Amino acid sequence: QSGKSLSVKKVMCTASPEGEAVPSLLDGNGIEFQPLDVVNWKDYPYKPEVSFRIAHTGREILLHYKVKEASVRAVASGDNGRVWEDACVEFFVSPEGDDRYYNFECNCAGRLLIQGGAVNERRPTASQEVLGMVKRWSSLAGEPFEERLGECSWELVMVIPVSAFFQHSVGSLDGKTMKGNFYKCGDKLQTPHFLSWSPIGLERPMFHCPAFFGTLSFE
């Protein structure tokens, strides 16, 4: 019972960091990796080795995922595409303790999907302006590509400004407590799979479940 908990350590930056620079920034501040290895459904037993880490600047959330899996894919031609089908890492979060939440899904090539809203309504997709706010970087960034079979190690970064919570007026992350979860998947990969950070007790693979989110304590 209860979900997991995380301390999101603060990092001191005068300006907004670029995605490529984040791994160095995080190693510089000793930000540790957390395993993302909860296999909630025995139907999909494949557990590719995945870890992540998180920190904040006060104005922005910094995420860094590391993955090692049997295949990768990035067909999605644009942002707000069908990224969950490609090799994809995800971050879901509710920032104000209300029922509205956000899902940031990003494929291994850097294409990103963002939606916002409560479970009981159509959760609209984000605008170009808002997609433009979220800086990204990947080790497999660039052109879209058909599935490549073979063991592949990749990394991905998301710099999520506080303004990207497009349905809220979130000012500063300093000392806030949010609820969220982190996921790995790839619906159209050779071996589809479903992994989470904090556990989920629904009968089958479902990620849009605020009840099962863990706790995120921003320093």
Contact 156, 147 (CB under 8 A): no
- What is the resolution in angstroms? 2.7
Set out the domains of the chain in order of their start, with CATH numbers: 1-219 (2.60.40.1190)
In order of 191, 192, 215, the CA distances from 43 in angstroms are: 12, 10, 27
Method for structure elucidation: X-ray
Name the token pair of 17. 């960091």
Q: Is 205 helix (H, G, I), strand (E, B) or coil?
A: coil
In order of 11, 41, 48, 142, 184, the CA distances from 106 in angstroms are: 23, 22, 17, 13, 10
Enumerate residues 6+ apart whose C-beta is below 8 A from 135: 16, 17, 18, 19, 158, 159
Burial of 126 (0-12, 13-18, 19+ CB in 10 A): buried
Q: Tell me the C-alpha distance between 140 and 153, whole Å.
A: 9
Contact 198, 185 (CB under 8 A): no
